[PDB]
Amino acid sequence: HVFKSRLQEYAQKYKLPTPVYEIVKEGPSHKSLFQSTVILDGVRYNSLPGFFNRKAAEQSAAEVALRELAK
RNA sequence: CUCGAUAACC
RNA sequence: GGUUAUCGAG
Numbered sequence: 001h002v003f004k005s006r007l008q009e010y011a012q013k014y015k016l017p018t019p020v021y022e023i024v025k026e027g028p029s030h031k032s033l034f035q036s037t038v039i040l041d042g043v044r045y046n047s048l049p050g051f052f053n054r055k056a057a058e059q060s061a062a063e064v065a066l067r068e069l070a071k
Numbered sequence: 072c073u074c075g076a077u078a079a080c081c
Numbered sequence: 082g083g084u085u086a087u088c089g090a091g
Binding site for chain 2: 029030
């Protein structure tokens, strides 16, 4: 519920462009499923897939992003 | 608010 | 033509 921003903030602290998000929507329009990939510093990071709304997609990808940034 | 579905029933 | 309910989206 808070990664999307931690990263946005990383973008500031390092001048970098604001995170581009990418939604893979797929399934019955009601049982829609989402996967996401952030592309910060033109670098792709994949969310764990099958989220039920867009945001939980983005968050998974942000939460992932930051996982590799601590490194 | 609008648009995209699905189940159900008359 | 409806209706009740249920979900996602800008």
